[PDB]
């Protein structure tokens, strides 16, 4: 309803808004289409421009600021000006920026204030993941290795953390979303989808590192079969370890509901807990679209095989 | 389901009516349905503010309007259907009949079918 | 008639190209 | 002599038009297949085994029970699941069906009638050596009883609710544990119980 | 005889149509249900459990209010969100509905009247044991209101605004907090208050 | 003088047109060809080297066996897998054929009559230096076969089942191993033996 | 497919014939057929506790029916090609003929068709 | 026709269905779309529920089990009532439970007789493959182990070997099915390719194990060009290893053709050996799909190719 | 008119998706 | 109606796979 740009207002030229996120996602990403006469073009938006949008949030319902990025990328066409944006918060600077660090056996928490410390990223007080993870050194990017600590942090027990941007860096454990919204009252369609695909039933742990770790750990072996795996990292260097690592990998394969919603819960997020029936799901990605209709589709699964699968 | 009981309300003499115990006289399901439906009947909307507002009837405000007979017909089934029809043990309300006896003075006629009314089918594999 | 083919062709290829960028 | 009949069963009705419908009744019958053409040979036609949903439309007018209530009734017979039973004597038609499209009018003159134009459509039932399963299984029984001298709870659920040994359903109602006694061999004459759905 | 009433509710206005509806008023009904073919059995009908929007579409003319302003009343209604009450009395049609299309126009004679060709949608809300919320919520009140002998803020919240506890929501406007003392407990007769929204 | 012949064959029936076909009767041939355009040459035209299904269709009436039961019969007709042969006589049409869509009407007079608008498709049998097989294969025998007095099984399995050799087929139904001695050289005159399919 | 025979049952006598050594009088697998199917005709529907839905037929609660002549014949008709049509043997059951000989006392015939009536195509590769 | 399930017969809920395989799939894969009225959501078919389908074969004409498998995944719609599964025969389990092996110079029927041992594994007498593998060990999937060491025997002049689970596991042959189907006769329409973009004219071995095993074998130098790959297994420790390594990689590139049959042979599946004009050709893959007509679509090639991609 | 999009591209994601989990 | 589904799906395998063969 209001894109404040640097300074102007363009929420006078949009066709329509696409919010969507994935639990894995780089970062949340608005993709604003617009037309471009001769008045958007003078401003001459560029890439690296600063974008808020500003909607009445389903909450209390007053203005508040669902989006705050900055423009990726800009693509213009010419024969119909058509001006399309491809706006992303800045967790995709993390994810380009590479750079090596060397690790000592600590949390993921300070591992994320010294990756803040060092580039500079604000950042709100950061939870206290918990965790101990052990020593390792990194070359990927700053969000990979941000999701990298955050995985082996969810094993060994640790909750599931999800950092997303907004102004300043947060640190966003999965199920702790203020409303847990009831989806069915605005249901168009669902899927409900189960599958045996990323079934895991039993594991068989190798240790590449001493404390000789070995030990399998089969959870429903009588049920569903064994469904093994073999897990052969390095970072389990303990028995606890290993048994945790183990039982933050069973579940019962996918298990995941393909729900469209008819109206545009605006607050929802990746990784938010919401309803649906009397159960309730872990948000794995959202896809709202704020054309003149506002629309909401969303992907919610239960919380093992997200362990599972995205940690 | 599973909706209960509650007191007799004898409307004709606007008390509750009481055993020689003098407890008072409990009802079955269907009775308490049948006093609710004459209450929420009797209970205009909007005004009484110890209720909703999916309670109640607006009746006696339609007396004032200056909608014409017919009109004022299908105002009366629309009203006494919607009032009715909030309960969950009803089914359907129909069957309206109106005789307006004099000139300007009305009698109108409704039945009330419970969800206990349905037909079921007889079938099993 | 035949622009259905380019248009959902266009929309295919910037789908797929789109989810590979933001999961990579 | 042409007449129409439309018995339903979920509302035990049985509505017979007043008026013949109008200018003719059609019903068409169409083969399922699919053509199929081969390499230098050319088209081919493939039987499909199932068979068509066929409909039967016609237009009549409901003259001065009244036409509001008549429209009425049929309106709601519209959005009834459980299927009606259309039975037209001189055309010769007879079997189950449904009605897809429902619609009156009011004429300038003539406001009392009701102009109808109404359309059906074949019903056929989804079911989950020995005797073929082809019969239609549209009967229908009020949703209380009231138990007869010689009832016992397993013939009240074979007569009233299929296989026989859903009497249990019956039992654990509350309200039928209520009025029943604890023990369910033992049944009086006399007193309401609730089938189950 | 047959009038149409359109009550609107957002504007309090009660518009009554000065001529009736011309050559004919229809509607039609057409039952949820989409066919379902399965091998070597043919199609299916399954029954969809929802109701449909239906259509009731007529045309006028205005006769020498002014037929201008009629026209423009039904266009500035016709972007109205909240729903009109459409009444037809002879007919029998009750409910609420809002205007899909609206047209009018001038005849090279007459052309004082104006030919209108309207159209309505039947009107669904949504609301996003214990007793169904069935009732349409369709009532209308001032953004202003006086404050009664007998009002308490937290009456006034009911009345005014639903349940009750929104009268924070009244109190926490700059205005009534000016016109309303510090303490909510206790207000006064003829001081205006603002609900919110 | 013209007339119209429909001889099935599963049902040995041969059912004549009380009454020609109406107006006219009509019937189209399209060659099989699609074109292709070159670069700086424009379009061509190539031959395909299939033939096509054409239809024939006509409509009829059915005067006062009864039009009931021969549209029964016709309908009946419609379902079947088998080919008929249609043969008309003054415009010199002759081959197999099958119904794709029929249907009768009742008009508001002449209410015994039944007129009848039918459509027929060319019929081709897919078979799934030497004589080339294009014998249509529509004769028919009845399921059940009283054995003659020169008749060996060999014999009976070439003229009732084709090949000869599949007189197995015959012998190993359980009836057959029964009515026939356990010698299958040796048969009898009148007993009853059953080929398979 | 795999259908067996019965014993005989005289419906004139209502009696199983029986031979001379006291056995019941075995019948082929088509007589055994025919013997069923007079019985389903004769069987009411859902009356008689000890069979299935499938089972029975519905002509004698017909006869209390107000529906007309031809009606009543068109139900005559589905009633006994529904009863009939349920066992595997049969193929199809037609040519209903009626006759209403006295003004209101019906005589009718129907025919059944057996699936070893079906007619077979005579070719092979 | 009939789709037993565990007790019912779902066959009169089912718009239709389609068998499909490839020749390096998973599983024999049938996915059967139903409608879900009240009767069918009665019965609440879950995940892990054993599918039997059953149909007039084309050979005898008579009722056999064409596909016996178990339910992999079950997706329902609830706006439309359309219950959909995907069938699969449990080669599937196989695919999923990973284990590790050490395994000494031996051949592969011992090998797969030895994980069927392992993992009680119902299995027919399994052919002998005959040729003699180097000593591995190996980490991934159960079918993927199976999968290489069939691989490692059709190098070294061994025969094309799959296997196929139906009730109990077995060693299928590629050019050992019964009947060789003619498809000419019902062929609605083809596409012969031919290519050669997988093209074998040469090939360089380098030996990474001793019997210094080095060579080349280029087959049709002068005709197509030399084509050239060069071989680094360590499996190849022998010269007649490299030799008929060599020999079982050379071909004329890719020689395909994409059948479409508007009558569906029921009994066809993947490696089955099929005519199509005179030539004859391996199904590479095959897809039935059995709607109110039924109808099949292949995909058949010739065996140099298919042991040059596949194995 | 429009519901092509979205049937085919659902079509799309399933072919692909299917053709990933049976091939790997 | 029913062909544009045969003929876009295979405009997008031939695409993609012509893709893949080409930069790979």
Redesign the interface.
């Known amino acids: 309803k209001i894109i404040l740009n640097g300074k102007y207002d363009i929420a006078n030229f949009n066709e329509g808004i696409t919010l969507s996120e994935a639990i894995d996602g780089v970062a949340y990403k608005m993709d604003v289409s617009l037309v471009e006469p001769k008045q958007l073009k003078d401003i001459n938006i560029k890439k690296g421009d600063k974008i808020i949008l500003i909607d009445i949030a389903y909450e209390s319902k007053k203005e508040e600021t669902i989006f705050d990025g900055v423009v990726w990328e800009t693509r213009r066409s010419e024969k119909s000006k058509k001006l399309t944006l491809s706006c992303r918060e800045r967790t995709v600077y993390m994810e380009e920026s590479e750079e090596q660090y060397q690790f000592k056996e600590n949390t993921a928490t300070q591992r994320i204030e010294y990756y803040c410390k060092q580039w500079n990223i604000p950042y709100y007080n950061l939870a206290n993941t918990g965790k101990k993870l052990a020593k390792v050194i990194h070359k990927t990017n700053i969000l990979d290795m941000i999701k990298k600590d955050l995985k082996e942090t969810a094993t060994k027990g640790g909750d599931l953390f999800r950092v997303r941007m907004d102004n300043k860096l947060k640190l966003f454990k999965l199920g702790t979303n203020a409303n847990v919204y009831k989806l069915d009252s605005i249901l168009e369609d669902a899927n409900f989808t189960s599958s045996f695909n990323d079934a895991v039933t039993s594991v068989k742990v190798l240790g590449k590192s001493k404390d000789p770790i070995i030990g399998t750990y089969k959870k429903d072996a009588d049920k569903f079969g064994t469904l093994q795996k073999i897990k052969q990292d390095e970072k389990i260097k303990n028995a606890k370890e290993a048994k945790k690592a183990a039982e933050a990998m069973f579940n019962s394969g996918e298990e995941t509901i393909s729900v469209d919603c008819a109206v545009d819960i605006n607050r929802i997020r990746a990784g938010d807990k919401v309803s649906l029936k009397s159960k309730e799901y872990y948000v794995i990605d959202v896809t709202h679209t704020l054309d003149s209709r506002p629309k909401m589709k969303l992907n919610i699964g239960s919380l093992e095989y997200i362990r599972r699968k995205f940690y | 389901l599973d909706l209960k009981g509650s007191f007799l309300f004898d409307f004709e003499k606007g008390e509750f009516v009481k055993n020689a115990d003098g407890t008072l006289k409990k009802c079955d399901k269907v009775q308490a349905y049948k006093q609710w439906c004459q209450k929420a009947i009797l209970t205009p909307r909007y005004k009484k503010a110890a209720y909703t507002n999916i309670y109640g009837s607006e009746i006696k405000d339609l007396i004032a309007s200056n909608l014409s007979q017919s009109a004022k017909e299908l105002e009366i089934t629309r009203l006494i259907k919607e009032t009715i029809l909030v309960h969950p043990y009803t089914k359907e309300v129909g069957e309206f009949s109106f005789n307006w006896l004099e000139n300007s003075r009305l009698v109108e006629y409704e039945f009330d079918v419970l969800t206990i009314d349905d037909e079921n089918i007889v079938i099993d594999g | 008639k035949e622009e ?2 380019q ?3 266009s ?2 290829e910037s ?1 797929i190209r789109e989810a590979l ?4 | 002599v042409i007449d129409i009949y439309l018995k339903n069963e979920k509302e035990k009705i049985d509505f017979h038009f007043p008026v013949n419908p109008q200018d003719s009744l059609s019903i068409k019958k169409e083969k399922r297949f699919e053509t199929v053409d081969i390499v230098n040979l050319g088209e081919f036609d493939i039987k499909k085994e199932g068979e068509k949903i066929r409909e039967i439309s016609f237009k009549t007018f409901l003259p001065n029970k009244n036409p509001i209530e008549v429209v009425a009734m049929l309106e709601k017979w519209v959005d009834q699941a459980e299927p009606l039973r259309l039975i037209i004597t001189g055309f010769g038609y007879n079997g189950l069906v449904t009605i897809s499209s429902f619609s009156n009018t009011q004429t300038a003159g003539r406001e009392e009638d009701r102009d109808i134009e109404i359309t059906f459509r074949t019903y056929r039932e989804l079911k989950i050596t020995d005797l073929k399963d082809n019969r239609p299984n549209t009967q229908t029984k009020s949703k209380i009883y009231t138990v007869k001298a010689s009832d016992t709870l397993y013939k009240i659920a074979k007569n009233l609710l299929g296989k026989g040994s859903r009497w249990p359903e019956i039992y654990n109602i509350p309200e039928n544990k209520k009025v029943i006694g604890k023990n369910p061999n033992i049944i009086k004459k006399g007193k309401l119980v609730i089938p189950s759905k």
Chains 1, 8 share one sequence.
Do not use: F, R, T
């Open positions: 259905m083919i248009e959902l062709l929309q295919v789908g960028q933001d999961i990579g």
